Structures are given as C-alpha cells and as structure tokens.
Design a protein around this ligand. Structure first.
Ligand code: AR6
Ligand code: NCA
Length: 209
DNA sequence: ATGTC
C-alpha cells in the first residue's frame, strides 16, 4: 500500500551557510526575483533561466522565481549535483544547510503558497493550492534514496512547495547540517541576531550523500 | 548507483 504524507508535512530549503547572515538580516528567505543579498549561488544557471520565465498557473500567479522554493524531502537530487561538484559552485555539500518548516505552518500563517507534483520547470507539472491535494503527490518517489530512474520517479521526487515573495525566518523549526563544524558556525551566526528565533541545529548525515 | 533538465 502506497505511503501517505506525515502531518505536520515537513518542507526543506537548502542554502549555503554563507547566505545565513543575509537571511537573518532580512528576517526572511526572499524569492529570486526579490533580489536576496545572497553570497553563494548553488544553482544551475541554465535551469535558473527556465524558472525565470516559467508561469505559475494558480493564484497569486507570476513565475517560479517569484516564490521561495522548498522540497518535501531532504537529500534532494539538486544536493547530489552540488555534492558531485557538477555545479559552478565547487564547495561541495558540507556547507549546505537544510532549513526545515511545514506546509501546515505556512497555511496557519496565512501566507500565499502553491505546490507541484513534480519538478516545477516541467510543462506537465500539476499545480495546487489546497493542502488536501498533498494526496496527489507520490510519497514513495519523494522518500526514495535511489531516484536516478525510472523517469516518473525522478520527476515526482522533486515536487515543490512554493511560498510567494518571502518566507519569515520565525517559521523555521530546524537547521540540519552535515558536520559538527558547520553546526557550530550556524550557532555563532544565530547568536549575532539575538532577537531572531534560534531553531534547533541537528547533525543529520543521512540527509547528505 | 543517482552528476535538478
Ligand atoms: N535573505 C536572504 N539572504 C541571503 N540569501 C538568501 C536570502 N533569501 C534567499 N536567499 C538565497 O538566495 C537564493 C535564491 O534563489 P532560488 O532560485 O530561490 O533558489 P536556489 O538557487 O537555491 O535553487 C534554485 C535552483 O535549483 C534548480 C535550478 O537550477 C534553480 O535555479 C537561494 O540560495 C536562497 O537560499
Ligand atoms: N533551494 C531549494 O531548496 C529548492 C527547493 C525546491 C526547488 N528548487 C530549489
């Protein structure tokens, strides 16, 4: 019998540790089109250019770059490309944070969101607004440790949770890290912003390659 | 195993 979604339903945003000061200084993740003060890009430029022009067909509309992106799993295919040094970024996985929240927290906060059933740049991706439609996602695919094939599993592992324009730091519940050295550095950065929520910092080597 | 398509 096919797996269901946990409730609350965790959502994950990966970013380089060099960006955490900018996230705390703004008090939020900003969408790409909101010009976040990022220090370190870990993206593929050629797929960023697709996101730059990919329409979001549910309200509040706009394009994929108008939304702060999350996945429904850690240990993403994106993180594999970073781990293997396939990106322009050559620093590897160790300085990449997993920022964790939930779908339900976003809804309760009244923030506009959409989600997809597969990688959002695919022309056949379905888009949803109602958390009951989390039943449309493939939770086997989302949880799969081996995702390279078959193709439908590879697409559906990359179902995305999309928050319009900005995501408030106070909705982050956990920062997951690869190593003790990165966890310590995360805590030093948080202590420079004493008015900000300090989520638990957890070493989760099984969220990495 | 997996170099986001
Ligand atoms: N306030 C902030 N201060 C500093 N950095 C920030 C802030 N807010 C966000 N960032 C970072 O600013 C950046 C916003 O970029 P985006 O497009 O949304 O996410 P991606 O680049 O991770 O993944 C997209 C790629 O995945 C696949 C395709 O190749 C896509 O291009 C992120 O690093 C944020 O953490
Ligand atoms: N940076 C990310 O975690 C992310 C999540 C979903 C899609 N693209 C990027």
């Amino acid at each position: 019998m096919k797996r269901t979604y946990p409730e609350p339903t965790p959502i994950y945003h990966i970013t380089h540790i060099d960006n955490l000061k900018g996230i705390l200084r703004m008090g939020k993740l900003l969408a790409h089109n909101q010009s976040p003060p990022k220090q370190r890009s870990i993206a593929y430029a050629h797929i960023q250019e697709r996101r730059n022009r990919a329409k979001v067909p549910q309200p509040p509309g706009g394009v994929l770059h108008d939304y702060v992106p999350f996945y429904f799993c850690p240990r993403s295919p994106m993180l594999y490309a970073i781990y293997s040094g396939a990106t322009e970024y050559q620093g590897g996985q160790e300085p990449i944070l997993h920022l964790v929240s939930s779908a339900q927290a976003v809804h309760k906060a009244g923030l506009p969101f959409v989600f997809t059933d597969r990688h959002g740049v695919l022309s056949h991706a379905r888009f949803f607004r109602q958390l009951e439609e989390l039943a449309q996602l493939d939770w086997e695919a989302i949880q799969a440790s081996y995702w390279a094939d078959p193709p439908e599993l590879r697409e559906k592992k990359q179902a995305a949770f999309l928050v319009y324009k900005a995501f408030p730091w106070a909705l982050i519940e956990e920062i997951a890290v690869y190593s003790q050295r990165v966890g310590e550095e995360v805590l030093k950065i948080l202590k420079q912003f004493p008015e900000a929520r300090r989520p638990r910092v957890c070493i989760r080597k099984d969220w990495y390659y």
